[PDB]
Symmetry: C2
Subunit: 157 residues, 2 copies
């Protein structure tokens, strides 16, 4: 059991985790999300892994299998007249293998993100979650996260 | 009373209204929002007024007095393997003068925005609102709006 930075060789396993979460979003919001195979572009994954401001973390179990992964970004907004300069870690992905959920792995990954965040003296960790996603909302709430803002919608069709 | 598109000459009044709302945000989330005079850039207002994909609407009820305004944008996202192609109206601003509230003015502006969305056959109207902003949430809820997704935060500093 370790958390390490991902390599490009982790692609297939991470891609599989991404598709679990993506298919859940297709199911609930098919007006926004579309089914595709794969759901994670291998070149885009490689870019995240090697990116200057991005980092991919994996949780690897006792049998050297990927049980979870996350993609994070160090984000800097410039000073503006009406907005504070702000440095954040943005989590664009955090997936735990569906059959390994409810057993500590997500929290372990997130603790590593916090460690990274603090070492870079960021103001906050941020992420976006779809409103239907009760499981994610409960998880992130349990970690001390709260709503900053929300996207509201009025369908017109 | 009338609703019409803004002109450049509307800047000073529209700016004053923008400032009421900006200051509210500075008050409640000074970590994100910064005080400045003005809070609305005049050139950027002009661009919104004349923009190809943007529209500025004002409610006029009194001589030399704008009671409300809104800025909206026609947004189109391309077909991707994993995301549906999407056409929306995005409301970047909608302010009703603090002293003119409680008389249906916001609703009238929003109805105009709906008509715009329909005329352009958009999938939906969208906007973002900050979590502290109970007054705006109740207003948008009352007009049929629902939460699509939310930004969550964990301050580290």
């Amino acid at each position: 059991m370790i958390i390490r930075e991902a390599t490009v060789q982790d692609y297939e396993e991470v891609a599989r985790l991404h598709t679990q979460v993506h298919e859940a979003h297709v199911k609930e919001r098919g007006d926004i999300f579309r089914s595709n195979e794969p759901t994670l572009n291998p070149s885009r994954f490689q870019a995240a892994v090697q990116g200057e401001k991005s980092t991919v973390l994996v949780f690897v179990d006792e049998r050297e299998k990927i049980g979870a992964y996350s993609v994070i970004h160090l984000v800097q907004t410039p000073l503006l007249p009406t907005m504070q300069q702000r440095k954040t870690v943005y989590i664009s992905d955090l997936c735990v293998d569906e059959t390994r959920r409810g057993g500590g792995i997500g929290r372990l990954i997130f603790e590593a993100i916090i460690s990274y965040g603090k070492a870079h003296q960021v103001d906050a960790i941020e992420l976006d979650v779809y409103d239907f996603n009760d499981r994610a909302k409960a998880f992130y709430h349990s970690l001390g996260m709260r709503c900053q803002k929300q996207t509201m919608e009025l369908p017109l069709l």
